Amino acid sequence: LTMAEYFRDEQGQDVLLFIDNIFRFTQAGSEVSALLGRMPSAVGYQPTLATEMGQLQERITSTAKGSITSIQAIYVPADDYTDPAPATTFSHLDATTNLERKLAEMGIYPAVDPLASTSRALAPEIVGEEHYQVARKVQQTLQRYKELQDIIAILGMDELSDEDKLVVHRARRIQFFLSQNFHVAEQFTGQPGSYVPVKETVRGFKEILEGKYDHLPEDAFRLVGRIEEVVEKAKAMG
């Protein structure tokens, strides 16, 4: 953190602070607390837990000069989201990137779950209607395609209600266009990778949500950049 703060205040940058498993920290916290002879607290947690966490986070922010963004891998205690350890952490969270092995097995990387991974920044007040609209919509069209998984094994892909088949069609391309080209990936792939601004990412989705692409194959929007790249991915040549 300290090494990070430097580049924030001295060079006024926006630096990334990764902490792989911030639970180890709090766990070490109660772990040390014992040795010093501290009377245990809820679930044998150092009574000073909130405090020790509060001091770790608050030192992570955007100053008038720089900023520090932290990505902490929160590995929640036994699948219990009420445990004072995570429960504490969550109060310091402005966002979540939920990775799932499913979307990986399908060939969507990043594996970021589109309906689970949340964020506080998603709000008209913040990102305006444009972003919030499309974005909240692109989620809706997913939680539609997700539930129809049961009815699709029932009434099949036929006459399942056409206001739905449009969803099922559009939705597939959408969850496919969430996969991106990672520069870091160029090592073993060869595709140089992508960087799409929110601006670009808003259009590509709004347009797809207008169906302006429904006439294009799935394996188009799967691992690309700007919507325009999907389009060029339509030249099968000869």
């Binding site: 009377m39 245990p40 809820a42 679930v43 044998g44 219990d80 009420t82 445990d83």
Partner: protein, 254 residues
């Protein structure tokens, strides 16, 4: 408040319940896609009856409206599949006339169950074969259903089938308005035909209604987990907190 090992007993109980539930859903989903097999296999015979029953230009309203035929299952956990039909029946009987009159034939215990205590019973049917309804022993009911004519003009009560599990209860009617002149042979073979089709669509519903009622339970049971998982964690916490507080407070005492 409450236990922990009493919260485990509940989880595991619920779990083994969801298991048994979802089992049967899949099982009753396996009995929908065999309903066609005996639904299809009956498609031709029906076609080549109305094609015969094309009706020459050369038994209309006789006297009354009397007996019913009420289709069901013997097994339960079908949702309202039973009660529903056993409602219209019980309505348009007592919506009808109120003597001991207006008589009855039932397919499946569950029907005979209610019909029994209420009074006006005529026949019985038990043990229909499930997805494969044996066209045979329903043939004995066409006989009883017709020869009964002791009778006039019967109606049939059951549930129809539209697209997997969605369905609705019906009264299509039958014994009225749609060598040479052999009606003695079409009258019979046109009832045997209808009472049969009624079943296939009845059963198709049954399995479906059950396929679902066994989902609703599974789904619901699954939520009983969440409601308990939560109360288990909480009781998992207060417990590990009390144990520790006990172990320290017993040390400071030394």
């Amino acid at each position: 408040m409450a236990s922990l090992r009493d919260i485990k007993t509940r989880i595991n109980a619920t779990k083994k319940t969801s298991q048994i539930t979802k089992a049967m859903e899949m099982v009753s989903t396996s009995k929908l896609n065999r309903a066609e097999q005996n639904a299809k296999s009956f498609v031709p015979y029906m076609e080549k009856i109305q094609e015969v029953v094309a009706n020459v230009a050369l038994v209309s309203r006789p006297v009354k409206k009397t007996g019913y035929l009420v289709i069901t299952s013997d097994r339960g956990l079908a949702g309202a599949y039973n009660s529903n039909v056993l409602r219209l029946v019980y309505q348009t009987i007592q919506r009808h006339a109120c003597p001991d009159e207006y008589a009855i034939i039932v397919i499946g215990r569950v029907g005979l169950s209610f019909f029994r205590k209420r009074n006006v019973i005529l026949d019985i049917t038990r043990l229909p074969d499930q997805p494969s309804f044996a066209d045979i022993k329903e043939i004995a009911r066409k006989t009883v259903g017709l020869f009964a004519d002791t009778f006039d003009e019967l109606y049939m009560y059951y549930n129809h089938y539209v697209s997997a599990i969605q369905q609705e209860v019906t009264e299509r009617k039958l014994l009225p308005l749609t060598q040479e002149e052999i009606l003695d042979v079409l009258l019979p073979q046109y009832a045997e035909s209808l009472i049969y089709g009624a079943l296939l669509d009845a059963k198709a519903s049954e399995h479906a209604a059950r396929m679902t009622a066994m989902k609703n339970a599974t789904d619901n049971a699954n939520e009983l987990i969440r409601t308990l998982t939560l109360s288990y964690n909480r009781a998992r916490q207060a417990a590990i907190t009390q144990e520790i507080t006990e172990i320290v407070a017993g040390a400071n005492a030394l």
